[PDB]
DNA sequence: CGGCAGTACTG
DNA sequence: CAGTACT
DNA sequence: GCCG
């Protein structure tokens, strides 16, 4: 990145809107940085500011403001409150409106949280692995979770296909948590699994606790076992095989990535989810499906891409 | 002016 | 529903 | 916040 010295500042900033509510200019914040991570060149001069998409004036203007000056004058007056807001939201299951009604009622710290906070089911476990939660681990780690899920679940049906997706089907060193995709190619055998998988993983103690268990998608936490090991989150989802391709990509990502690809299939008439890619899909003036398009038949990941008009990118350049 | 991805789950 | 979460 |  030729320009740390000033997305460094500038994360500060997404950080503090994000954390307070205002999505909308996070979101600028978050594309205006890694455009101006992805430039070749140190930026220069506010007229190649507004050279890289994404930079506007605004942010043209506060760039120079830091290769002049050095700084930022609004980190500043950055809101006290942002340290704390930022401490609560990392609680999994508290995000900006719980964080901020937790501050308007006194709270400061997670002391306080635990005390005198009421807790959702799911943030009470968040808070519980609050230090766990922040770490990644190592990639390594993500395969002993993987093949533990995997083989929990091939002991029931032989045919089920399991693959660790997110991060780490991306190739990175180190995993958020561990998102593993199943599937059956019979088309059929994948229904039901859900009881039977996770009873499985219980059995002698791997999943630790649950955070959401629905028809196709499970999020908990699990550890394998023996000493040194910490808490991690896990996501399985499963699908039947028809959507294996979508629910790949999708469950691949990067998140950037894949808004990037929805927003340009919605640009060219059509709709891209973790089920189908659609064409033909008919909307209204405020952008949204009022009308269902055709599902396109998508086998593979390529399918997805070529339907598209896209090169095909191995998830190792999806990582955005 | 107004979208900024599209979906699942919780209570 | 609003909130949070997943990529 | 940016952009069509
Ligand atoms: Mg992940
Ligand atoms: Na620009
Ligand atoms: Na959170
Ligand atoms: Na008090
Ligand atoms: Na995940």
């Given at each position: 990145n030729h320009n740390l010295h000033i997305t460094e500042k500038l994360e500060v900033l997404a950080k503090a809107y994000s954390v307070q509510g205002d999505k909308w200019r996070a979101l600028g914040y978050a594309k205006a940085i890694n455009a101006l991570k992805s430039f070749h060149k140190p930026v220069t001069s506010y007229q190649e500011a507004c050279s890289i998409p994404g930079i506007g004036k605004r942010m043209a203007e506060k760039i120079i403001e830091i290769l002049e000056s050095g700084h930022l004058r609004k980190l500043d007056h950055i809101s006290?409150?942002?340290?704390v807001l930022e401490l609560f939201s990392n609680?999994?299951?508290a995000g900006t409106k719980t964080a901020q009604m937790w501050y308007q009622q006194g709270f400061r710290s997670l002391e306080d949280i635990r005390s005198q906070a009421s807790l959702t089911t799911q943030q009470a476990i968040g808070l519980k692995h609050y230090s766990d939660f922040l770490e990644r681990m190592p990639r390594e780690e993500a395969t002993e979770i993987e093949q533990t899920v995997q083989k929990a679940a091939q002991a029931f049906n032989s045919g089920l296909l399991c693959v660790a997706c997110g991060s780490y089907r991306r190739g990175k060193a180190t995993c958020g948590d561990v998102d593993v995709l199943i599937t059956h190619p019979d088309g059929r055998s994948h229904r039901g699994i859900f009881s039977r998988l996770l009873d499985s993983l219980r059995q002698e103690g791997f999943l630790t606790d649950d955070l959401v268990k629905g028809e196709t998608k499970y999020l908990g936490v699990c550890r394998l076992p023996g000493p040194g090991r910490r808490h991690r989150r896990l996501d399985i989802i499963v699908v039947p095989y028809s959507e294996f391709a979508c629910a790949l990509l999708y469950?691949?990502?990067?998140?950037?990535?894949?808004?990037?690809?929805?927003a340009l299939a919605k640009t060219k008439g059509m709709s891209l989810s973790e089920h189908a890619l659609s064409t033909?899909?008919?909307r209204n003036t405020h952008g949204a499906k009022v009308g269902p398009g055709r599902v396109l038949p998508t086998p593979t990941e390529k399918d997805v891409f070529r339907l598209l008009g896209l090169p095909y990118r191995e998830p190792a350049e999806r990582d955005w």
């Amino acid at each position: 990145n030729h320009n740390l010295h000033i997305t460094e500042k500038l994360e500060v900033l997404a950080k503090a809107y994000s954390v307070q509510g205002d999505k909308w200019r996070a979101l600028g914040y978050a594309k205006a940085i890694n455009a101006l991570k992805s430039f070749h060149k140190p930026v220069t001069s506010y007229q190649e500011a507004c050279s890289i998409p994404g930079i506007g004036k605004r942010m043209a203007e506060k760039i120079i403001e830091i290769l002049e000056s050095g700084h930022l004058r609004k980190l500043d007056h950055i809101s006290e409150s942002v340290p704390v807001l930022e401490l609560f939201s990392n609680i999994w299951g508290a995000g900006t409106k719980t964080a901020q009604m937790w501050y308007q009622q006194g709270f400061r710290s997670l002391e306080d949280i635990r005390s005198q906070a009421s807790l959702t089911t799911q943030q009470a476990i968040g808070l519980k692995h609050y230090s766990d939660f922040l770490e990644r681990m190592p990639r390594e780690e993500a395969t002993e979770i993987e093949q533990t899920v995997q083989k929990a679940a091939q002991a029931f049906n032989s045919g089920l296909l399991c693959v660790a997706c997110g991060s780490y089907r991306r190739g990175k060193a180190t995993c958020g948590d561990v998102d593993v995709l199943i599937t059956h190619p019979d088309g059929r055998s994948h229904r039901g699994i859900f009881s039977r998988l996770l009873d499985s993983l219980r059995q002698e103690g791997f999943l630790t606790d649950d955070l959401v268990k629905g028809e196709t998608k499970y999020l908990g936490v699990c550890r394998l076992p023996g000493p040194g090991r910490r808490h991690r989150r896990l996501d399985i989802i499963v699908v039947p095989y028809s959507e294996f391709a979508c629910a790949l990509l999708y469950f691949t990502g990067s998140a950037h990535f894949n808004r990037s690809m929805r927003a340009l299939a919605k640009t060219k008439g059509m709709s891209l989810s973790e089920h189908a890619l659609s064409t033909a899909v008919v909307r209204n003036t405020h952008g949204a499906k009022v009308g269902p398009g055709r599902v396109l038949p998508t086998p593979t990941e390529k399918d997805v891409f070529r339907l598209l008009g896209l090169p095909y990118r191995e998830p190792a350049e999806r990582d955005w």
